[PDB]
Amino acid sequence: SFVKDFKPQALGDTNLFKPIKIGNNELLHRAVIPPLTRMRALHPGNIPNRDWAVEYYTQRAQRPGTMIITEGAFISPQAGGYDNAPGVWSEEQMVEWTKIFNAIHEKKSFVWVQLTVLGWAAFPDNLARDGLRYDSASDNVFMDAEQEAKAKKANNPQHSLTKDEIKQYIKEYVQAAKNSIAAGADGVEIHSANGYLLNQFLDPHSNTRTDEYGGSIENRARFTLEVVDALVEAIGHEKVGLRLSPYGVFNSMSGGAETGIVAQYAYVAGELEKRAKAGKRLAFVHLVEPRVTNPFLTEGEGEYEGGSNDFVYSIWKGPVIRAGNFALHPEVVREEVKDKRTLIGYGRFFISNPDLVDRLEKGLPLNKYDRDTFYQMSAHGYIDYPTYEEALKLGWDKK
């Protein structure tokens, strides 16, 4: 069915429908697919879904010149811990990714691989089964009681990374980025948001370290910036973006309750701009808005009203992708895209609307999403959401 009560607005007369270049890619509009974990990868080996993933991405590439950021992809076994999320370390994985990238390109769209390392969000028992550590910044603060207890039961207590182990992750980021490019991706996004490992280092709640990787703003940002620099060196700044969620609380990050949180993220933005002014500007910065501090809460819930991401624009002078509850709020998008370097990520409603871009241009009704199938091993709720035309034929204009 269509979302009831939603009053659509045609956005074709806004900058959302003006072309923009991101990295090497000439986008034809500024509606971006943000990274969306869907849990259709198959075990063993974290293999992108051999039956459905090509079709999923093909559908969502249908509007020419769309920027697609993939579901998060693990850079190595140790970086993972969800059996049904994909990786980008093995030949068997890359065979499937190559097909996905080719399909997106055939639709004249673009694809950026999000590179993910889970840290404390991983399942410690899966990791133990596979002979892997349960990692985070620290060893004395935990995501929640259940995770702490699972780790202990698995004889895999949370482990504070050594400097050598941080270096090993950086090597894996580099190789994962190389693999992604070699398989045909247009670029990569470094996931430093939503309470995963890099965010666990950024945040003073999760990072109680007293070495050079914690205990100050500069130290907490060190790992994220080392990954940025390693990937810029390996594949070029024009092929690298960075995702941040300053006000997020998902996965036990601090959000605005931490009075130093804006300074922490302002520091990262400033270091990005310093690199840019020295000739190595990242393709984009991708921000999760305080509009959505936890993406598993219904739109409108978990809104933090005490902060704005606007500060980033005073610092970083390149493209900025904003995501969080924009599909149901074209009136907000209309204002935000007046800034000529702003793009808008649409997550949950891209799950349910393969032709979302047409719907945004033309002010059409939106298909309701089905949260129960966000994570499910099924084509249902993955590749069977209709286009607007197909929905009309099903009679959704009445139902």
Next chain:
Amino acid sequence: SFVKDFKPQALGDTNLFKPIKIGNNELLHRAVIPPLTRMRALHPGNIPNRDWAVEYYTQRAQRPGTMIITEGAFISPQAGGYDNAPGVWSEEQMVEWTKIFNAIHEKKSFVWVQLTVLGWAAFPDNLARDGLRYDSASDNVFMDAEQEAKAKKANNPQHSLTKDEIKQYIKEYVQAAKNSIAAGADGVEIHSANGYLLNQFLDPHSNTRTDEYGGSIENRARFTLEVVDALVEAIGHEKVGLRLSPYGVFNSMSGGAETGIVAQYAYVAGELEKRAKAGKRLAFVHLVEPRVTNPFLTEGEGEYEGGSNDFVYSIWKGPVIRAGNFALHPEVVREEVKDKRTLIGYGRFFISNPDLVDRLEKGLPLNKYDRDTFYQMSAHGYIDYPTYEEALKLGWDKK
């Protein structure tokens, strides 16, 4: 004469004319007199002007319930270096300040003493004459070539403060704050702006230290925060505010060219909010806007368009006074005061309009200022600017 071409707007229908409490003071409107050095203090001894200063402040206190921040006042001889700016360390000074504070209070207005330490902005030859150091954060970067050369000629080369000397300044801030309160002031403003000593510590251009007072965001903010904490302890948070100029370039500060500048100031704001949440909220934060990066340039010049102070409001949750080119821009003020904790400082046009508040409420013409008498040892251009009524009688509605 009146400013030609200026199209006034009545602001009586805005929050500029709603009461607000700042510290212990019930203000009746939100037009604030920011600190304005006028150079009428007499030598020797940096004595507030015995002939004219009471009248100057009385005139500008005339609208009941006005918050006045004094001209900067030196906390000690070593903090000074301008012979015609006043101090607040001696009995002879406080005799004159007492008269000024009494006069402001008789007009049912309020007075906050700005506490000033010049650092590298001081004149090294005056300091040498008086047996005093020429101080800054560092000893290997200078305000400009002329200052460096003056210091060398005076056998008084710029000196990087020791930790003990920083402690001595803090003692002097404490005593100056006590003196101000005992003499009748409503509070004090810590000057950490416009490239004076505390700002020289905040800014990475001027602060090349490698001890705990430089080399990182936290270290560069340490001196400013130590002064905040010492004054909060001595006289109470409700009697203390702090002035900052994030984007200023006056006195060779970095401004927006420094990519880390927003993070530096965001850190200070966050530390202020942390203290506030722990029960010790400063009376206000006073920001110089990027609208005026150098207050000796004509309105509209030296405007930095690449940054906003809005970030501070995501962090600090108390009153904020904004200053910089607002008199000629009632349309901007109208928008800014929609925020219910925003006050507006009017500097140069309070020099020339003793009845500025009435003029703002009622949308009246503004007297042109005379920059040549901003700093001058004279009543002329100090206490002889007319009220609107007096200007009409002089025929300025025609001239």
